[PDB]
């Protein structure tokens, strides 16, 4: 006997104020009952269950499954109630490694932890809560009643405290050899280095020699899986990684939940496939909760899919990582609120791509979109590979330092350099900041009645140049653009505008190149038409000159 | 300090569980020399997946220092964290502060790490050092003695504080010293190189009582609601006037018995922005009248202690800030300007996190505590950036602006 160490175990409670579960078994067949006693008896013996006396008073309900092909009978123990009630742990295991994050390595081994799962003991004093019950034939006797020694396969802790008990069993191996790489995954440990297959396979007995200090025998996975790895949905291949096969389906019938199909599979796939789109495919899914619903495509997302199509025909890959490179993160504007970026060390071998939506908004404009673009990149890079990459961004630097100097808002991007790939971002239009000299001074107002939707939108000007138009199914907020929009389109060149209206100002003080409003569109493609253009507030109903003039115009 | 003392959570609470966000590697390689040499102290230790809190931690450095520096963020923590009157029924702040002429930011934050923490509260203090790629797991720890930045710390060591520096208040009596969180305020009304004299005279004495040699130098002497000032001109033009009635129209929320229509008057007509309008008598008065009315002080501005204090920052261009801290709006308690924010040249958002940890400093010397910021930026941009610049052992709240406020002329 060769003297093992024990998994230190972990101490487990129940919500507070909780109990246990007590929750009936339910009646059983002959035949299941002598399948679980069979079944229980074996692992009775193997001292994952411990028979229990009629004192302790909770239960979990017990089931027998079996499957088509293997003439077994499968145990179950209903683990739902008794979660319920469990402490939360750490969840130390949600997110996975990006392959793009991954070296490669010369050698990979998989070792199977199955059975090491099962010396993993239970807290003790929670052992008590895990105890279902065996009915007996034809309940004439006493049901059989177990509880766990070992983690129960269903219970809520089982994952978290398994991983947490074999990442500190392998933590003095890793730690004393940093030429190897270690990964565990359900039942699985991943073992890589760039060693020679001669001293690879020697780290991979040494550290079996170290898991034998507490009693764990860890054969090779059956049936050896040759590469690539198909884990969390790629294909990890030893110089190359890729997401699975892509097959897009034919169809001319698409519902709402075939279009939520297709959008998984695109987000998918954009991580390496270049210039993924998915607007006008998801624009199909605005607000609906009927899957079944069948939604004809636009002519418009027609186009988007078979874009992708054409994007999908052939497969692609990317490259795993060089520490020694330089990161570099390119980015180009698509369109309709849609942005593409590839990460790369060296031209046309891509370790990833991504895509970035425009987010919800009445307004915004291409500057904007292009700074959260590259925060969310630079979020995932440092995810990735903790460093933020260089940027190569489709907009120039004059146009950069002419947006954040003037631009209300503090901003900032992280180390870039221009590309010239079009279509590129640029200002479309800058007011002035101060009256230009022998422009025409517009002095512009709106009013709309509340109840009658009624208004009126105009400008008086210091030529005396007047307009007033009457307005049906309008707002005040409405006939106050009405009224820029319209000395813009009878102005020169170069024009003074005054405004009392805080909401017009609000609006193109913000700066938008688009809208959901076309009126402000209406105003924006004007201003892109102007040479000069200044714009100038005053508070209403004081008495100022013009202002005075046109508000008496424009209400009623 | 063998016996802890007892410290709860408030009643139906739970610990924290904040999101720890990603970290370059170069700070988790920090963490982990910092983290590892704490744990060989016994000041934290690693935890178990029985522990499911956490509290974000970043790593950065002091003003002026290569070494780096461990942050935890307890912002969380500390919000449900019981309220605390560990010896008393509080602090009275010292309203004398303000008033000294210097006064030096001291790092005391080290003794934290010689006061257990109470075995029962530790759990509540965990803490992960990230992976990157999650390529393994964090590193998760715990906290076995008081730590920094906790509202808990100040408060459970501030018995032990307040006999440590009895003797040199003993024989300094003019000197305030206030505590904040980690840091210690020394002020004096002495010249410049007096005051010196005895922070080096208070830190030696702390270094004998069981350090950092850090420190920071204030001047509340100019503190206050900076004066709404209208322009001084020979010839207006039609544009001028109309500046001028919208920011007296503006202050006429603040101030009673502003008028503009005289200067209104001016405006009669329909005129080219650009043509000189020439001020009459009367419109000369009234302007006078409401430069008069500028000079006095806002009526009815009082600090109450249980509102929150706000702070708006509005960026003016080239290097340049304003601020106006107030609990009620347009009943400012504080006004100011930044120029030339150091070593951000071409920066905006570093320049904002450094005006955000002055004017933290600022409220923390006036009434102690941080006031909650309106932040002119988006948050995506500030919440990748802010971290990078961040030099204080203490973080205020915040929220985002998303429309200009017109009122950034009026402060220019
Ligand atoms: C070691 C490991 C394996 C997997 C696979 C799961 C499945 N299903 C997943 C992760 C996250 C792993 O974890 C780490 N993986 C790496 N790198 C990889 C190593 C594997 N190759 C692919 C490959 C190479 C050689 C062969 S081969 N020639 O042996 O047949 C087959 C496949 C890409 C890079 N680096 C680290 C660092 C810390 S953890 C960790
Ligand atoms: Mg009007």
Not at chain 2, 243 to 248: I, P
Not at chain 2, 285 to 297: G, M, Q, S, V, Y
Request: aromatic share 10%; glycine share 6%.
């Amino acid at each position: 006997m060769v003297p093992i160490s024990p998994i230190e175990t972990v101490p487990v409670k129940l919500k507070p104020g909780m109990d246990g579960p007590k929750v009936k078994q339910w009646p059983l067949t002959e035949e299941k009952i002598k399948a679980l006693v069979e079944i229980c008896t074996e692992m009775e013996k193997e001292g994952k269950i411990s028979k229990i006396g009629p004192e302790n008073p909770y239960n979990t309900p017990v089931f027998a499954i079996k499957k088509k092909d293997s003439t077994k009978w499968r145990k179950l123990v209903d683990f739902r109630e008794l979660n319920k009630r469990t402490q939360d742990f750490w969840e130390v295991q949600l997110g996975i490694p990006h392959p793009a994050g991954l070296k490669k390595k010369k050698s990979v081994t998989v070792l199977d932890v199955g059975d090491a799962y099962f010396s993993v003991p239970l807290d003790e004093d929670f052992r008590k809560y895990t105890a279902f019950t065996i009915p007996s034939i034809n309940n004439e006797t006493p049901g059989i009643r177990y509880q766990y020694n070992v983690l129960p396969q269903g219970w809520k802790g089982s994952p978290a405290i398994f991983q947490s008990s074999m990442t500190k069993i392998l933590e003095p191996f890793a730690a004393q050899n940093p030429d190897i790489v270690i990964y565990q995954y359900m039942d699985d440990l991943y073992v890589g280095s760039d060693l020679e297959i001669g001293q690879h396979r020697t780290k991979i007995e040494e550290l079996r020699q170290h898991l034998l200090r507490w009693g764990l025998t860890t054969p090779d996975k059956k049936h050896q899986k040759e590469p690539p790895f198909l884990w969390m949905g790629y294909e990890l291949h030893p110089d190359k990684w890729t997401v699975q096969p892509i097959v897009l389906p034919e169809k001319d019938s698409w519902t709402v939940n075939d279009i939520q199909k297709l959008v998984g599979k695109l987000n998918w796939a954009s991580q390496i496939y270049p210039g993924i789109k998915v607007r006008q495919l998801s624009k199909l899914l605005r607000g609906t909760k009927a899957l079944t619903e069948v939604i004809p495509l636009t002519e418009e997302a027609e186009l988007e899919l078979a874009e992708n199509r054409e994007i999908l025909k052939e497969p692609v890959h990317g490259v795993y990582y060089d520490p020694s490179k330089d990161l570099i993160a390119e980015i180009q504007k698509q369109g309709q609120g849609q942005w593409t970026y590839q990460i790369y060390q060296e031209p046309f071998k891509n370790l990833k791509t991504g895509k970035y939506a425009r987010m919800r908004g009445a307004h915004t404009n291409d500057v904007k979109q292009l700074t959260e673009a590259v925060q969310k990149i630079t979020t995932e890079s440092i995810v990735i590979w903790g460093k933020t990459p260089k940027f190569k961004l489709p907009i120039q630097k004059e146009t950069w330092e002419t947006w954040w100097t003037e631009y209300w808002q503090a901003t900032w991007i992280p180390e870039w350099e221009f590309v010239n790939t079009p279509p590129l971002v640029k200002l479309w239009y800058q007011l002035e900041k101060e009256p230009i000299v022998g422009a025409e001074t517009f002095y512009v107002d709106g009013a709309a009645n509340r109840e009658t939707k009624l208004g009126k939108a105009g400008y008086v000007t210091n030529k005396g140049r007047q307009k007033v138009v009457p307005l049906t199914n309008t707002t005040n907020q409405k006939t106050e653009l009405q009224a820029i929009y319209l000395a813009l389109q009878d102005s020169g060149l170069e024009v003074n505008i005054v405004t009392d209206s805080q909401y017009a100002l609000g609006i193109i003080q913000a700066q938008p190149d688009k809208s959901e409003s076309e009126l402000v569109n209406q105003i924006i493609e004007q201003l892109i038409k102007k040479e000069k253009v200044y714009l100038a507030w005053v508070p209403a109903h004081k008495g100022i000159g013009g202002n005075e003039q046109v508000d008496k115009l424009v209400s009623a | 300090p063998i016996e802890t003392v007892p410290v709860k959570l408030k009643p139906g609470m739970d610990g924290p569980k904040v999101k720890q966000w990603p970290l370059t590697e170069e700070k988790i390689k920090a963490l982990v020399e910092i983290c590892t040499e704490m744990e060989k102290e016994g000041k934290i230790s690693k935890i178990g997946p029985e522990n499911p809190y956490n509290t974000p931690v970043f790593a950065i450095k002091k003003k002026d220092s290569t070494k780096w520096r461990k942050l935890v963020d307890f912002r969380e923590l500390n919000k449900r964290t019981q309220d605390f009157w560990e010896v008393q029924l509080g602090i009275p702040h010292p309203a004398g502060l303000k008033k000294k002429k210097s006064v030096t930011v001291l790092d005391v934050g080290d003794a934290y790490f010689s006061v257990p923490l109470d075995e029962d509260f530790r759990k509540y203090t965990a803490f992960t050092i990230p992976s990157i790629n999650n390529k393994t797991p964090g590193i998760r720890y715990q906290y076995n003695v008081l730590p920094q930045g906790w509202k808990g710390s100040p408060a459970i060591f501030q018995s032990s504080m307040t006999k440590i520096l009895e003797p040199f208040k003993k024989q300094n009596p003019d000197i305030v010293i206030y505590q904040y969180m980690d840091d210690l305020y020394v002020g004096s009304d002495l010249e410049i190189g007096q005051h010196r004299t005895k922070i080096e005279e208070l830190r030696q004495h702390l270094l004998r009582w069981g350090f950092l040699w850090m420190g920071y130098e204030l001047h509340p002497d100019k503190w206050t609601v900076q004066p709404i000032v209208l322009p001084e001109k020979d010839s207006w033009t039609v544009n001028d006037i109309q500046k001028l009635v919208g920011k007296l129209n503006w202050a006429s929320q603040i101030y009673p018995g502003i008028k503009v229509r005289q200067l209104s008057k001016l405006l009669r007509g329909t005129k080219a922005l650009t043509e000189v309008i020439p001020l009459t008598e009367e419109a000369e008065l009234e302007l006078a009248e409401n430069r008069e009315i500028l000079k006095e002080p806002v009526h009815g501005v009082y600090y109450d202690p249980s509102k929150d204090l706000i702070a708006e920052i509005q960026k003016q261009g080239q290097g340049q800030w304003t601020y106006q801290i107030y609990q009620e709006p347009f009943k400012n308690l504080k006004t100011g300007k930044y120029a030339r924010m150091r070593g951000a040249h071409t920066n905006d958002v570093k320049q904002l996190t450094e005006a955000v940890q002055k004017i933290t400093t600022e409220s923390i010397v006036i009434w102690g505590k941080t006031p909650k910021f309106k932040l002119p930026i988006q948050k995506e941009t500030w919440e990748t950036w802010w971290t990078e610049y961040w030099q204080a052992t203490w973080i205020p709240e915040w929220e985002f602006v998303n429309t200009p406020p017109l009122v950034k002329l009026w402060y220019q």
